[PDB]
mmCIF file of N, CA and C and ligand atoms in Angstrom:
data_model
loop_
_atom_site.group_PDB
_atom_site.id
_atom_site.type_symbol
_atom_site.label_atom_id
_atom_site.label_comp_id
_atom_site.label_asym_id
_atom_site.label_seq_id
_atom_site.Cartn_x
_atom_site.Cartn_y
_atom_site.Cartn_z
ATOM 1 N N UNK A 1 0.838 -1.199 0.000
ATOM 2 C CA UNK A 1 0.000 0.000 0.000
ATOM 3 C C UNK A 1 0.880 1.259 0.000
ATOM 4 N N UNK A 2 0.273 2.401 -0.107
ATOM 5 C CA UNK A 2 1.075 3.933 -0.243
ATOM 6 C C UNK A 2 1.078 3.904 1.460
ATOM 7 N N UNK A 3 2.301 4.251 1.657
ATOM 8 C CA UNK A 3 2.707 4.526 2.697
ATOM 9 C C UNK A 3 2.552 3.514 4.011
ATOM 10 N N UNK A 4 3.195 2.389 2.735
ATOM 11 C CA UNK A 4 3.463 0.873 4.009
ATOM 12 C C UNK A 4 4.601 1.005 5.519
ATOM 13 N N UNK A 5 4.082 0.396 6.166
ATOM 14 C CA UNK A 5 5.477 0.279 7.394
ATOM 15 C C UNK A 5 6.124 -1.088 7.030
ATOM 16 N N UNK A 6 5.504 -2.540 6.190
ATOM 17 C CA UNK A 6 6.291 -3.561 6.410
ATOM 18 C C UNK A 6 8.166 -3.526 6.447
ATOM 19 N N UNK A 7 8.763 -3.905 7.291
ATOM 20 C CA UNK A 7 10.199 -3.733 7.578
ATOM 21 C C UNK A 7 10.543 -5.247 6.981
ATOM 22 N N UNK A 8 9.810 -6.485 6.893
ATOM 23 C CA UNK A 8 10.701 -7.714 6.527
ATOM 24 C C UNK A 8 10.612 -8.545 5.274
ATOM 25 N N UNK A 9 11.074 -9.038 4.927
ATOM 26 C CA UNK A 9 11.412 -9.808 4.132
ATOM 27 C C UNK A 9 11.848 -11.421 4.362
ATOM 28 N N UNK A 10 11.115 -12.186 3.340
ATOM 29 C CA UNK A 10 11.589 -13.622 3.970
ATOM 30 C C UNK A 10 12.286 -14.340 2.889
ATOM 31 N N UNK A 11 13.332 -14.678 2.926
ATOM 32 C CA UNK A 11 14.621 -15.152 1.772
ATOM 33 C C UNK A 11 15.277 -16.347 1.934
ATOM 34 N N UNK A 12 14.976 -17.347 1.159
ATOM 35 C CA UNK A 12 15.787 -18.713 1.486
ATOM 36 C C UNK A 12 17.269 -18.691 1.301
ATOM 37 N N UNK A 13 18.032 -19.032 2.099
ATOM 38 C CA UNK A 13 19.749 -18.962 1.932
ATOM 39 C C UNK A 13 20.427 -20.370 2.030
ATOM 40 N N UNK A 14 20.240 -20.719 0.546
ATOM 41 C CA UNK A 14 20.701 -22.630 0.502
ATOM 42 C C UNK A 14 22.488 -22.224 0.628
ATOM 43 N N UNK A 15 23.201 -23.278 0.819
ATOM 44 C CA UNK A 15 24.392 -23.241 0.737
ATOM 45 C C UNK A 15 24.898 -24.579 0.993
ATOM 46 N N UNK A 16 25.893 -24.927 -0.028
ATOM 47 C CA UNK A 16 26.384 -26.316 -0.770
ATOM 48 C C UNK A 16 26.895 -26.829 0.648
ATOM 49 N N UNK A 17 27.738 -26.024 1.619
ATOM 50 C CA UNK A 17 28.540 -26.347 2.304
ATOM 51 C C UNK A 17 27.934 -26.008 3.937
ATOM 52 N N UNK A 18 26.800 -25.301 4.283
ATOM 53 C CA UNK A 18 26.576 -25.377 5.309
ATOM 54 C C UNK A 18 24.688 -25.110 5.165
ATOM 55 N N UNK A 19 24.222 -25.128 6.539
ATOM 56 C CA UNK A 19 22.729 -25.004 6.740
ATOM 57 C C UNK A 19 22.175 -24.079 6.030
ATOM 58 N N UNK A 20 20.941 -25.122 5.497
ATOM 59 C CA UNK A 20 20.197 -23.598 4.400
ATOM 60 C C UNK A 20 19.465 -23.090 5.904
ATOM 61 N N UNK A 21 19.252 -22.362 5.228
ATOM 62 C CA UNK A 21 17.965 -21.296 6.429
ATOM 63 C C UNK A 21 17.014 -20.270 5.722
ATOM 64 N N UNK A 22 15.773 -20.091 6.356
ATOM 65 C CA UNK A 22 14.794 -19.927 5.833
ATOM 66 C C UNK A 22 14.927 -18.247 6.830
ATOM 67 N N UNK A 23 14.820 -17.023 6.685
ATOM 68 C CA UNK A 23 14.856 -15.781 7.833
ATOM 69 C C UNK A 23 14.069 -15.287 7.405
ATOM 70 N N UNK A 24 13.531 -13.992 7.946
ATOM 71 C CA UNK A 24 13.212 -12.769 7.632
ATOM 72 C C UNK A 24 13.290 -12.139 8.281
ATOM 73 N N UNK A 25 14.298 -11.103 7.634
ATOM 74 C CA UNK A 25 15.002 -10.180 7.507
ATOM 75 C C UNK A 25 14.025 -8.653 7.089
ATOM 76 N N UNK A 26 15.014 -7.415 7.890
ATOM 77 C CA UNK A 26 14.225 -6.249 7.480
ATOM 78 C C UNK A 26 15.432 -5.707 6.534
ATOM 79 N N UNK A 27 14.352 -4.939 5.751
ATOM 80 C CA UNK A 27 15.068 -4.628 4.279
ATOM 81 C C UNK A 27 15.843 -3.343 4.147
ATOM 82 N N UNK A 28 15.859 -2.639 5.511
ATOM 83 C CA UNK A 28 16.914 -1.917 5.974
ATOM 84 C C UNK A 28 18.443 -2.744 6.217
ATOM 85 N N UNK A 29 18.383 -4.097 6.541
ATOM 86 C CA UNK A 29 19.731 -4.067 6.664
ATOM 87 C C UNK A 29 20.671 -4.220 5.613
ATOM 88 N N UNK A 30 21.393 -4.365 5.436
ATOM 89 C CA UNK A 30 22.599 -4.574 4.617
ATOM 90 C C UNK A 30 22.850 -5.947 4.294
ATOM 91 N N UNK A 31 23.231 -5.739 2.985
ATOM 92 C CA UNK A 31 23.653 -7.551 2.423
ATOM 93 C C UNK A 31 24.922 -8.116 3.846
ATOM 94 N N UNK A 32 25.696 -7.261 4.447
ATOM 95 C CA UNK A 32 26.552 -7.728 5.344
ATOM 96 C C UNK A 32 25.620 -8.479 6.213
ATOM 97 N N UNK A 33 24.903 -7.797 6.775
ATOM 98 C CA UNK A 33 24.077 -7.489 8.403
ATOM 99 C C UNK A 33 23.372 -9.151 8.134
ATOM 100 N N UNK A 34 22.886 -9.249 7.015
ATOM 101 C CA UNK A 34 21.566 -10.622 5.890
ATOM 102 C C UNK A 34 23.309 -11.926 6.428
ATOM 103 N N UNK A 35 24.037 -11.450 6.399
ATOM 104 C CA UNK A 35 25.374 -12.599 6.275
ATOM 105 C C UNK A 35 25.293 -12.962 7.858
ATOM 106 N N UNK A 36 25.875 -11.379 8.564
ATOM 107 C CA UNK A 36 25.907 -11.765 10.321
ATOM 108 C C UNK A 36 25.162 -12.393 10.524
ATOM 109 N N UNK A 37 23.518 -11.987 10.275
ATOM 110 C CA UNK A 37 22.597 -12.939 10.578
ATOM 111 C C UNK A 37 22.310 -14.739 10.496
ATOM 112 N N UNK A 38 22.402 -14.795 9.254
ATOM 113 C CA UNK A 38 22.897 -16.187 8.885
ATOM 114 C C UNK A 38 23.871 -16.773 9.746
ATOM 115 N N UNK A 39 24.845 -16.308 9.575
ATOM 116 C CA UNK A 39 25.813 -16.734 10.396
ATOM 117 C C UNK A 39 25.394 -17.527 12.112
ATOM 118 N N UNK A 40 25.152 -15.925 12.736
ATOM 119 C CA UNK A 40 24.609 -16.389 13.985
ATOM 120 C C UNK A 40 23.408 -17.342 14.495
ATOM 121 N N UNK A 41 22.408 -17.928 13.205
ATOM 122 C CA UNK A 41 21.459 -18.661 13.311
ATOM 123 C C UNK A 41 22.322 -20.234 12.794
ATOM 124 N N UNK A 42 22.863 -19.928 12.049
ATOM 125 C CA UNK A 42 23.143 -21.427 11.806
ATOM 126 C C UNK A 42 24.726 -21.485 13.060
ATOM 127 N N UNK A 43 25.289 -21.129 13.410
ATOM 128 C CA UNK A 43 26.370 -20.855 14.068
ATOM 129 C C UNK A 43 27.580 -21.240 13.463
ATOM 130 N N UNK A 44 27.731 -20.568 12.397
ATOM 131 C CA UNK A 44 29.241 -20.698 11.716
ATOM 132 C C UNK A 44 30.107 -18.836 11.768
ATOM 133 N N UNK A 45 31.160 -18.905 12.064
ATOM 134 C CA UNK A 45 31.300 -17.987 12.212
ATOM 135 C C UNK A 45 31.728 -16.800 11.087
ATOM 136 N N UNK A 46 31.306 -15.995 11.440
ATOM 137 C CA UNK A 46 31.530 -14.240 10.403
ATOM 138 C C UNK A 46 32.659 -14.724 9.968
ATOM 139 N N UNK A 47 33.139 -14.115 8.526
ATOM 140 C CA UNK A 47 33.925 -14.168 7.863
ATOM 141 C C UNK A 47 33.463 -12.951 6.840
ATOM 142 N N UNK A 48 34.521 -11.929 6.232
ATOM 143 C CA UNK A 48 34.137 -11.395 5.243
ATOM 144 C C UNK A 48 34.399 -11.629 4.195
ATOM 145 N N UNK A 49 35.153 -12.899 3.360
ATOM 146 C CA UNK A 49 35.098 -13.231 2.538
ATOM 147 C C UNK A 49 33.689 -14.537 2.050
ATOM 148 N N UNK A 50 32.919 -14.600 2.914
ATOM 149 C CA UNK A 50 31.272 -15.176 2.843
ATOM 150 C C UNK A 50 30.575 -13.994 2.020
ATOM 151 N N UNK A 51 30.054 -14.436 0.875
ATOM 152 C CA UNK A 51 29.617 -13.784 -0.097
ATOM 153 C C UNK A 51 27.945 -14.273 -0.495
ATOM 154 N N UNK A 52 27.375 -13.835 -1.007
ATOM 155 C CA UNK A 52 25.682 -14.103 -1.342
ATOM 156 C C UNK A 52 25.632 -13.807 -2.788
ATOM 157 N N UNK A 53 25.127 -15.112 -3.247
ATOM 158 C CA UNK A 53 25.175 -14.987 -5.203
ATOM 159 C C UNK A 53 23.316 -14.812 -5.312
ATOM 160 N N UNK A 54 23.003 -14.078 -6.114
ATOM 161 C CA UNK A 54 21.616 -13.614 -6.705
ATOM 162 C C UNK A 54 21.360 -13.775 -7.939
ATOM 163 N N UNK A 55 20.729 -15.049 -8.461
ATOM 164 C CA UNK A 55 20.597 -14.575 -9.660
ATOM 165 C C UNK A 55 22.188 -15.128 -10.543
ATOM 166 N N UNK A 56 23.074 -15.417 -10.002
ATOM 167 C CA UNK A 56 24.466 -15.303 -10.592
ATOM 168 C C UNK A 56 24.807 -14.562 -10.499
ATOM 169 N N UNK A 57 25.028 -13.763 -9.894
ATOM 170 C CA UNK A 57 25.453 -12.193 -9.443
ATOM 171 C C UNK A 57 25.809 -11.797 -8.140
ATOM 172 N N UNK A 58 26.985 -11.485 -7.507
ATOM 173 C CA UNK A 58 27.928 -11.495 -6.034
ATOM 174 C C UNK A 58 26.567 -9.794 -5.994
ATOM 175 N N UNK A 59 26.004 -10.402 -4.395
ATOM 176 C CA UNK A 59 25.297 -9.027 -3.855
ATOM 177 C C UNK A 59 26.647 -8.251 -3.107
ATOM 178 N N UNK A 60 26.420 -6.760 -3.226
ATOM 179 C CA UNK A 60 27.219 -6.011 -2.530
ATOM 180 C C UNK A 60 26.708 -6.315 -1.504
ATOM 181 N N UNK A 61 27.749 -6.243 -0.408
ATOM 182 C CA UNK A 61 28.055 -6.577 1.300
ATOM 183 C C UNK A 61 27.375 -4.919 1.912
ATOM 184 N N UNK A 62 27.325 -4.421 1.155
ATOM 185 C CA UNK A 62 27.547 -2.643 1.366
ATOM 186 C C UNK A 62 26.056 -2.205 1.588
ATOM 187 N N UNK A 63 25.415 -2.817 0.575
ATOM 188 C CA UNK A 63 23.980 -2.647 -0.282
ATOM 189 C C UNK A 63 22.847 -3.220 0.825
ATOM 190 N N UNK A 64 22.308 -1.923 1.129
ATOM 191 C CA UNK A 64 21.102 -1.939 1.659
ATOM 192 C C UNK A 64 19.891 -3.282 0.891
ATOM 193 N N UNK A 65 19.728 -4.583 1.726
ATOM 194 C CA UNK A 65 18.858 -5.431 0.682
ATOM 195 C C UNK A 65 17.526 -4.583 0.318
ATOM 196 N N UNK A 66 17.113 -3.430 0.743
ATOM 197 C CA UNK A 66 16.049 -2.823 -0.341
ATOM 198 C C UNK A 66 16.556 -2.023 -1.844
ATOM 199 N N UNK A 67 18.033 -1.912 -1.560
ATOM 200 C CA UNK A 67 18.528 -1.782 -2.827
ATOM 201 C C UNK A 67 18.542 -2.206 -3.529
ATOM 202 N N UNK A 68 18.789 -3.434 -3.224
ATOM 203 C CA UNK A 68 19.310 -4.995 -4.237
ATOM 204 C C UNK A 68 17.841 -5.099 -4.829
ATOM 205 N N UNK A 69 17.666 -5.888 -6.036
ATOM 206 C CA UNK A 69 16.590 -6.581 -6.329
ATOM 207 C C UNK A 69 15.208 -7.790 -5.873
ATOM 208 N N UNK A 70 16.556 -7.785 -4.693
ATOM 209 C CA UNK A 70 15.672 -8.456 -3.442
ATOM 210 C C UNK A 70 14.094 -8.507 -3.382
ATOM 211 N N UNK A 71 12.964 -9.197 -3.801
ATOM 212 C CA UNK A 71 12.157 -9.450 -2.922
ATOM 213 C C UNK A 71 11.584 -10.394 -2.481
ATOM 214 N N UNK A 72 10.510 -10.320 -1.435
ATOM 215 C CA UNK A 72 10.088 -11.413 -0.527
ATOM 216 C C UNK A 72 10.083 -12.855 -1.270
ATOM 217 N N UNK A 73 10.252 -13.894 -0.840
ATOM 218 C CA UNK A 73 10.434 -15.054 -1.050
ATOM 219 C C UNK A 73 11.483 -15.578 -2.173
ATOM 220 N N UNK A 74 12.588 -14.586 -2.073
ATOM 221 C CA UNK A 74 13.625 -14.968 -2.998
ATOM 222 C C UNK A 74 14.407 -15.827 -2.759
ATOM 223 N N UNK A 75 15.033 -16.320 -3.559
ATOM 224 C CA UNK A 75 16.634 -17.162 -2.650
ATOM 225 C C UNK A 75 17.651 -16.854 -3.742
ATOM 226 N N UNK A 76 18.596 -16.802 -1.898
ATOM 227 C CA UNK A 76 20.488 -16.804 -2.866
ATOM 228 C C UNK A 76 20.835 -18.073 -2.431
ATOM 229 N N UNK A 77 22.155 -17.959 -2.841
ATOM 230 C CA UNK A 77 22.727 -18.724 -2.283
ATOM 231 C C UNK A 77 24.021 -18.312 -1.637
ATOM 232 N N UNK A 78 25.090 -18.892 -0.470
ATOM 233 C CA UNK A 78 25.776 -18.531 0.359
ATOM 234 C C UNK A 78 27.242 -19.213 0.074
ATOM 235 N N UNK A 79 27.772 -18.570 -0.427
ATOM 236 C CA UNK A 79 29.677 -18.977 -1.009
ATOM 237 C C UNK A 79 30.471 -18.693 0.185
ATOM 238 N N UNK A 80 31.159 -19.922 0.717
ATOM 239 C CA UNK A 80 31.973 -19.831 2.109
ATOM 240 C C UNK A 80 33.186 -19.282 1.471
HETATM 241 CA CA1 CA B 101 22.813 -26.882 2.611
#
């Protein structure tokens, strides 16, 4: 609607090498913040070379996920 408050987003994050996980996430945070998160739910630890592919395409770490093309019920995937 014009002049929504929804803040989240819900994004599947498969990954070859560790736990997929299912979140939602608010679309204020940052492709980093979408990683910490992951991270701390499946409990593997932060790394900044952990990257998120979209589409075939490395998301900026930087990039607000309402920037990105991001929406609800998308999936990446998670490159250790
Ligand atoms: Ca997996």
């Amino acid at each position: 609607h014009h002049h929504h408050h929804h803040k989240l987003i819900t994004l599947l994050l498969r990954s070859s090498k560790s736990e997929d996980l299912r979140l939602s996430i608010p679309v204020d945070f940052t492709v980093k913040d979408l990683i910490k998160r992951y991270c701390t739910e499946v409990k593997i630890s932060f790394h900044e070379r952990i990257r998120l592919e979209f589409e075939g395409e490395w998301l900026d770490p930087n990039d607000q996920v309402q920037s990105t093309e991001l929406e609800d019920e998308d999936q990446v995937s998670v490159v250790l």
